[PDB]
Design an enzyme around this catalytic site. Sequence first.
Site, PDB file in Angstrom:
ATOM      1  N   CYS A   1       0.805  -1.254   0.000  1.00 34.55           N
ATOM      2  CA  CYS A   1       0.000   0.000   0.000  1.00 34.55           C
ATOM      3  C   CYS A   1       0.827   1.289   0.000  1.00 34.55           C
ATOM      4  O   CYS A   1       1.582   1.562   0.933  1.00 34.55           O
ATOM      5  CB  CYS A   1      -0.934   0.050   1.231  1.00 34.55           C
ATOM      6  SG  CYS A   1      -1.955   1.550   1.360  1.00 34.55           S
TER       7      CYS A   1
ATOM      8  N   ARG B   1       0.030   4.493   3.014  1.00 40.27           N
ATOM      9  CA  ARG B   1       0.150   4.307   4.456  1.00 40.27           C
ATOM     10  C   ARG B   1       0.539   5.500   5.316  1.00 40.27           C
ATOM     11  O   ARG B   1       0.491   5.398   6.527  1.00 40.27           O
ATOM     12  CB  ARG B   1       1.164   3.167   4.741  1.00 40.27           C
ATOM     13  CG  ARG B   1       0.629   1.831   4.271  1.00 40.27           C
ATOM     14  CD  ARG B   1       1.691   0.753   4.610  1.00 40.27           C
ATOM     15  NE  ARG B   1       2.626   0.574   3.497  1.00 40.27           N
ATOM     16  CZ  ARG B   1       3.798  -0.043   3.635  1.00 40.27           C
ATOM     17  NH1 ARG B   1       4.178  -0.495   4.843  1.00 40.27           N
ATOM     18  NH2 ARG B   1       4.601  -0.196   2.556  1.00 40.27           N
TER      19      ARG B   1
ATOM     20  N   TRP C   1      -9.316   6.440  -0.148  1.00 42.45           N
ATOM     21  CA  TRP C   1      -9.735   7.063  -1.412  1.00 42.45           C
ATOM     22  C   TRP C   1      -8.858   6.502  -2.523  1.00 42.45           C
ATOM     23  O   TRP C   1      -7.803   5.903  -2.287  1.00 42.45           O
ATOM     24  CB  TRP C   1      -9.621   8.580  -1.359  1.00 42.45           C
ATOM     25  CG  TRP C   1      -8.286   9.040  -0.881  1.00 42.45           C
ATOM     26  CD1 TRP C   1      -7.121   9.144  -1.631  1.00 42.45           C
ATOM     27  CD2 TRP C   1      -7.951   9.451   0.460  1.00 42.45           C
ATOM     28  NE1 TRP C   1      -6.092   9.605  -0.812  1.00 42.45           N
ATOM     29  CE2 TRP C   1      -6.582   9.809   0.459  1.00 42.45           C
ATOM     30  CE3 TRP C   1      -8.686   9.586   1.645  1.00 42.45           C
ATOM     31  CZ2 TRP C   1      -5.919  10.257   1.625  1.00 42.45           C
ATOM     32  CZ3 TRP C   1      -8.029  10.065   2.807  1.00 42.45           C
ATOM     33  CH2 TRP C   1      -6.663  10.377   2.781  1.00 42.45           C
TER      34      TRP C   1
ATOM     35  N   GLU D   1      -5.440   3.742 -10.435  1.00 43.55           N
ATOM     36  CA  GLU D   1      -6.179   2.481 -10.261  1.00 43.55           C
ATOM     37  C   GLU D   1      -7.356   2.460 -11.221  1.00 43.55           C
ATOM     38  O   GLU D   1      -7.748   1.405 -11.744  1.00 43.55           O
ATOM     39  CB  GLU D   1      -6.740   2.374  -8.824  1.00 43.55           C
ATOM     40  CG  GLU D   1      -5.629   2.263  -7.781  1.00 43.55           C
ATOM     41  CD  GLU D   1      -6.208   2.251  -6.376  1.00 43.55           C
ATOM     42  OE1 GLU D   1      -6.623   1.146  -5.921  1.00 43.55           O
ATOM     43  OE2 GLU D   1      -6.311   3.346  -5.743  1.00 43.55           O
TER      44      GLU D   1
HETATM   45  C1  HEM Z   1      -6.216   6.566   2.114  1.00 45.83           C
HETATM   46  C2  HEM Z   1      -6.050   6.265   0.799  1.00 45.83           C
HETATM   47  C3  HEM Z   1      -5.414   5.034   0.295  1.00 45.83           C
HETATM   48  C4  HEM Z   1      -4.768   4.974  -0.891  1.00 45.83           C
HETATM   49  C5  HEM Z   1      -4.631   6.153  -1.874  1.00 45.83           C
HETATM   50  C6  HEM Z   1      -4.280   3.641  -1.044  1.00 45.83           C
HETATM   51  C7  HEM Z   1      -3.611   3.199  -2.182  1.00 45.83           C
HETATM   52  C8  HEM Z   1      -3.439   1.840  -2.477  1.00 45.83           C
HETATM   53  C9  HEM Z   1      -3.116   1.313  -3.774  1.00 45.83           C
HETATM   54  C10 HEM Z   1      -2.997   2.153  -5.043  1.00 45.83           C
HETATM   55  C11 HEM Z   1      -3.008  -0.039  -3.682  1.00 45.83           C
HETATM   56  C12 HEM Z   1      -2.681  -1.001  -4.834  1.00 45.83           C
HETATM   57  C13 HEM Z   1      -4.009  -1.617  -5.322  1.00 45.83           C
HETATM   58  C14 HEM Z   1      -3.869  -2.489  -6.554  1.00 45.83           C
HETATM   59  O1  HEM Z   1      -2.882  -2.319  -7.341  1.00 45.83           O
HETATM   60  O2  HEM Z   1      -4.724  -3.413  -6.760  1.00 45.83           O
HETATM   61  C15 HEM Z   1      -3.209  -0.360  -2.297  1.00 45.83           C
HETATM   62  C16 HEM Z   1      -3.063  -1.642  -1.790  1.00 45.83           C
HETATM   63  C17 HEM Z   1      -3.454  -1.886  -0.484  1.00 45.83           C
HETATM   64  N1  HEM Z   1      -3.941  -0.994   0.454  1.00 45.83           N
HETATM   65 FE1  HEM Z   1      -4.030   0.934   0.353  1.00 45.83          FE
HETATM   66  N2  HEM Z   1      -4.604   2.911   0.027  1.00 45.83           N
HETATM   67  C18 HEM Z   1      -5.297   3.673   0.911  1.00 45.83           C
HETATM   68  C19 HEM Z   1      -5.895   3.294   2.123  1.00 45.83           C
HETATM   69  C20 HEM Z   1      -5.897   1.993   2.630  1.00 45.83           C
HETATM   70  C21 HEM Z   1      -6.498   1.568   3.850  1.00 45.83           C
HETATM   71  C22 HEM Z   1      -7.366   2.444   4.738  1.00 45.83           C
HETATM   72  C23 HEM Z   1      -6.153   0.230   4.059  1.00 45.83           C
HETATM   73  C24 HEM Z   1      -6.562  -0.649   5.191  1.00 45.83           C
HETATM   74  C25 HEM Z   1      -6.931  -0.146   6.404  1.00 45.83           C
HETATM   75  C26 HEM Z   1      -5.328  -0.155   2.931  1.00 45.83           C
HETATM   76  C27 HEM Z   1      -4.775  -1.406   2.779  1.00 45.83           C
HETATM   77  C28 HEM Z   1      -4.214  -1.759   1.540  1.00 45.83           C
HETATM   78  C29 HEM Z   1      -3.892  -3.188   1.290  1.00 45.83           C
HETATM   79  C30 HEM Z   1      -4.093  -4.370   2.225  1.00 45.83           C
HETATM   80  C31 HEM Z   1      -3.430  -3.267   0.015  1.00 45.83           C
HETATM   81  C32 HEM Z   1      -2.956  -4.506  -0.735  1.00 45.83           C
HETATM   82  C33 HEM Z   1      -4.077  -5.343  -1.346  1.00 45.83           C
HETATM   83  C34 HEM Z   1      -3.559  -6.635  -1.955  1.00 45.83           C
HETATM   84  O3  HEM Z   1      -2.552  -7.277  -1.518  1.00 45.83           O
HETATM   85  O4  HEM Z   1      -4.211  -7.086  -2.932  1.00 45.83           O
HETATM   86  N3  HEM Z   1      -5.150   0.958   2.122  1.00 45.83           N
HETATM   87  N4  HEM Z   1      -3.451   0.805  -1.563  1.00 45.83           N
HETATM   88  N1  LIG Z   2      -8.535 -10.702  -2.478  1.00 42.91           N
HETATM   89  C1  LIG Z   2      -7.755  -9.605  -1.899  1.00 42.91           C
HETATM   90  C2  LIG Z   2      -7.475  -8.489  -2.893  1.00 42.91           C
HETATM   91  C3  LIG Z   2      -7.254  -8.727  -4.267  1.00 42.91           C
HETATM   92  C4  LIG Z   2      -6.993  -7.658  -5.107  1.00 42.91           C
HETATM   93  C5  LIG Z   2      -6.943  -6.341  -4.600  1.00 42.91           C
HETATM   94  C6  LIG Z   2      -7.187  -6.100  -3.231  1.00 42.91           C
HETATM   95  O1  LIG Z   2      -7.152  -4.823  -2.695  1.00 42.91           O
HETATM   96  C7  LIG Z   2      -6.597  -3.736  -3.453  1.00 42.91           C
HETATM   97  C8  LIG Z   2      -6.778  -2.478  -2.622  1.00 42.91           C
HETATM   98  C9  LIG Z   2      -6.855  -2.526  -1.227  1.00 42.91           C
HETATM   99  C10 LIG Z   2      -7.037  -1.336  -0.489  1.00 42.91           C
HETATM  100  C11 LIG Z   2      -7.124  -0.096  -1.159  1.00 42.91           C
HETATM  101  C12 LIG Z   2      -7.300   1.093  -0.456  1.00 42.91           C
HETATM  102  C13 LIG Z   2      -7.367   2.305  -1.152  1.00 42.91           C
HETATM  103  C14 LIG Z   2      -7.218   2.284  -2.563  1.00 42.91           C
HETATM  104  N2  LIG Z   2      -7.246   3.448  -3.294  1.00 42.91           N
HETATM  105  N3  LIG Z   2      -7.041   1.108  -3.234  1.00 42.91           N
HETATM  106  C15 LIG Z   2      -6.989  -0.074  -2.553  1.00 42.91           C
HETATM  107  C16 LIG Z   2      -6.847  -1.259  -3.280  1.00 42.91           C
HETATM  108  C17 LIG Z   2      -7.459  -7.179  -2.394  1.00 42.91           C
HETATM  109 CL   LIG Z   3     -10.638  -0.820  -7.813  1.00 45.66          CL
END
Ligand code: HEM
Ligand SMILES: NCc1cccc(OCc2ccc3ccc(N)nc3c2)c1
Ligand SMILES: [Cl-]
Lengths: 362, 362
Positions: free
Chosen positions: B65, B68, B237, B242
């Site tokens: 992410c 963070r 957000w 994305e």
């Molecule tokens: C506040 C704005 C946030 C932005 C702009 C952001 C941005 C992103 C982006 C761009 C990704 C990559 C997604 C993809 O390529 O499929 C991501 C992954 C992730 N974000 Fe964030 N995020 C935010 C908030 C959060 C929050 C609040 C959480 C949890 C409390 C979170 C947990 C994660 C996790 C777990 C992933 C990885 C998902 C995976 O392994 O498939 N994010 N985030």
């Molecule tokens: N099955 C788990 C799985 C598969 C693929 C994507 C994913 O989460 C992506 C993800 C997670 C959290 C996010 C928070 C904010 C954001 N802008 N994108 C976010 C995108 C989670």
């Molecule tokens: Cl999405």
Amino acid sequence: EEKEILWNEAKAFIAACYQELGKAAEVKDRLADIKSEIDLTGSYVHTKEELEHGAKMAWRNSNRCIGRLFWNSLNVIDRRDVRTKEEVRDALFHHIETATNNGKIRPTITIFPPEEKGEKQVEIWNHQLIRYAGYESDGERIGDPASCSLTAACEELGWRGERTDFDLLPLIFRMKGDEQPVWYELPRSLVIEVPITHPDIEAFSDLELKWYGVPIISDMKLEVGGIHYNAAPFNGWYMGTEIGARNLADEKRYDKLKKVASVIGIAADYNTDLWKDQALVELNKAVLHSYKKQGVSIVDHHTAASQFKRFEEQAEEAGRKLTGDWTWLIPPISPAATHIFHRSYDNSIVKPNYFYQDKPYE
Amino acid sequence: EEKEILWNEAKAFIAACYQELGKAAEVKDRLADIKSEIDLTGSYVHTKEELEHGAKMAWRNSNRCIGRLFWNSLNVIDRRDVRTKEEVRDALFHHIETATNNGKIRPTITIFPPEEKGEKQVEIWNHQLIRYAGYESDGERIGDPASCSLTAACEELGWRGERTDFDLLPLIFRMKGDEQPVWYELPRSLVIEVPITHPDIEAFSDLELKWYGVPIISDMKLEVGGIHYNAAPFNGWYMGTEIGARNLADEKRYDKLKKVASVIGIAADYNTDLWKDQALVELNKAVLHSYKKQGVSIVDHHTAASQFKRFEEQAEEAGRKLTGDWTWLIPPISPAATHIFHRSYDNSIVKPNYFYQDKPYE
Ligand code: HEM
Ligand SMILES: NCc1cccc(OCc2ccc3ccc(N)nc3c2)c1
Ligand SMILES: [Cl-]
Ligand code: HEM
Ligand SMILES: NCc1cccc(OCc2ccc3ccc(N)nc3c2)c1
Ligand SMILES: C[C@H](O)[C@H](O)[C@H]1CNc2nc(N)[nH]c(=O)c2N1
Ligand SMILES: C[C@H](O)[C@H](O)[C@H]1CNc2nc(N)[nH]c(=O)c2N1
Ligand SMILES: [Cl-]
């Protein structure tokens, strides 16, 4: 002891090489002769066929290279006979001329005598045979920052750069037995350069950008069957993003995006305008356009990735494992528009291969 | 036996949590009570403070992410009290409303009762609470292909989509004790969507593209101190890439680049024209523009990477190791224009964290 490592690498290499070349029957006898040669001499000498095929296998096994579809057509020049610095210089000049080929770039490698007891016979200081100098002194930045330390070492040896943004570094290398390297200015007739213009935006020429035609990487070690060719410079043709997304764009390189934005008529004030992205795309279009207009080989990253997909398919059909370094194979612009982005690659190291080695300056 | 794993994870989590919260003195007694609670019951219950801080730590430890920096301001909603499917539905509706916040998106997580004996109390089928359906039957492709299998499972349960390209999937989840999940249509008043227009190119509206305002990921398991919250949907957000570089661009998603090229007036015939790249930049500019014009929070990838650099700096200052997954942190357009591209990251998994879990359909 190193005879052990050497003999082991030899067995593994000769078996695989001869199998690919249809020469599997000849392995036993060739290995017999190599075992004797190692025992008597501490080393062994590759046949011309082995060296050629080894260098091709090394390209094929280069995990970070998107351009490997063409591995089998590498032009291999055997210069193991060189003994003098004039011979080395002339070989390097010859490589520039023959690889350049009037613009129709031939992927080529020139292979110099290998390390003996870990002792280099020839040590090339250049990162590429053609590269621009860089200077930084009291606030003043000129040329390519990536060349600063090599430029300074050259000026310790009596070379003096003109301090344009595009001074060609001299060839610089050191012979076994010499305390110091020697340097030679590149003949300008050998070095093709391309001015960067844009297909639609006439003001783009105001940036007065240019780049050289052929990337000839000269600081890697080729390892084949336990023999270490520390001096073995090679080239392909450029992929346009290397020039437009990195050499001319990186902040620690020529850092041109803000100037590109201005000449294409967009503001460079707000991240949300994506002006860096727009500038990158226009700079990359200009680079491809410019090389093509001048008749100098270049590939765009989409075509390159499509060629790499065929390389993956050919590996599977040949029954060879594919290895790759995803972090280097994705291009630096629109990577998710390529198939590479959407799969994973085993980054295992397989030999023959090309390897980093320590700089002799720094 | 699992009491062992649980007690171990408990010790590690309570010690770290209380240390960050200034409550280091209370650890010994809290651990005493947890040891007893596990022995008597097979599990333990988190205080509100622990659960809140645990969910924040889980975001902080999410290697993939880029967002963070803001981990400590996560809004944590404790819904461990829910027992009925109406309560679950109402909690999910409430999360949409409060996270959306009229466009000024609040990062939020709603935490449902955790697994007991590995037995889920609530099993959410949606990948995101708001997502579009997808259909593919005899040549015909409609909507979001990534939703095809979930859409089909919903239509097995008596839901029927209108078969526009942007049908909202219903919420779908299953309660412990029920053989089948239930589904509920989203009230359209709760769901903000943004039409995509471009700042300078008026024809862009002809593509009739739109996207929803808030990504609310609802299929991951939050693990805190050995307790497994398999249902704990959360949102931030969007980062514009994305939507513009992946959801609307990928060939296996909405696949719009060729249509984008046409409305921006460029040919889509030659790779060397970089029309995919140019189309991507204009689509991404439109997405940022559109969200901003409608007052819905969004971040561009440059600003996001600058925020992530501050997150790395804050980790160092706090004396915490940084972990990260370079392959997910780089944005899919102009990645080498971000500092992320030029460094490496330790992809170690640290708990609390969010984890994939198996789909209940498929
Ligand atoms: C506040 C704005 C946030 C932005 C702009 C952001 C941005 C992103 C982006 C761009 C990704 C990559 C997604 C993809 O390529 O499929 C991501 C992954 C992730 N974000 Fe964030 N995020 C935010 C908030 C959060 C929050 C609040 C959480 C949890 C409390 C979170 C947990 C994660 C996790 C777990 C992933 C990885 C998902 C995976 O392994 O498939 N994010 N985030
Ligand atoms: N099955 C788990 C799985 C598969 C693929 C994507 C994913 O989460 C992506 C993800 C997670 C959290 C996010 C928070 C904010 C954001 N802008 N994108 C976010 C995108 C989670
Ligand atoms: Cl999405
Ligand atoms: C024919 C055209 C070729 C193209 C278009 C091509 C393309 C590329 C590109 C774009 C890179 C990444 C460079 C960077 O990001 O710094 C690369 C890496 C590499 N290429 Fe190729 N290549 C070609 C030919 C060759 C040849 C002929 C060899 C050797 C015989 C070779 C060996 C390598 C190696 C070793 C690397 C990795 C360098 C490192 O680890 O730093 N390539 N190639
Ligand atoms: N010190 C080893 C070292 C450091 C950095 C880059 C490098 O080589 C990059 C490289 C290598 C071979 C290439 C062949 C063709 C091409 N277009 N680019 C190419 C780029 C080699
Ligand atoms: C498996 C392969 O590495 C895959 O395409 C990953 C790469 N990088 C990514 N990066 C982000 N932010 N999101 C993704 O979905 C992916 N996909
Ligand atoms: C260390 C870090 O991963 C580094 O920036 C790498 C990443 N990917 C790359 N990819 C290519 N093709 N060339 C490079 O120089 C780099 N740099
Ligand atoms: Cl280069």
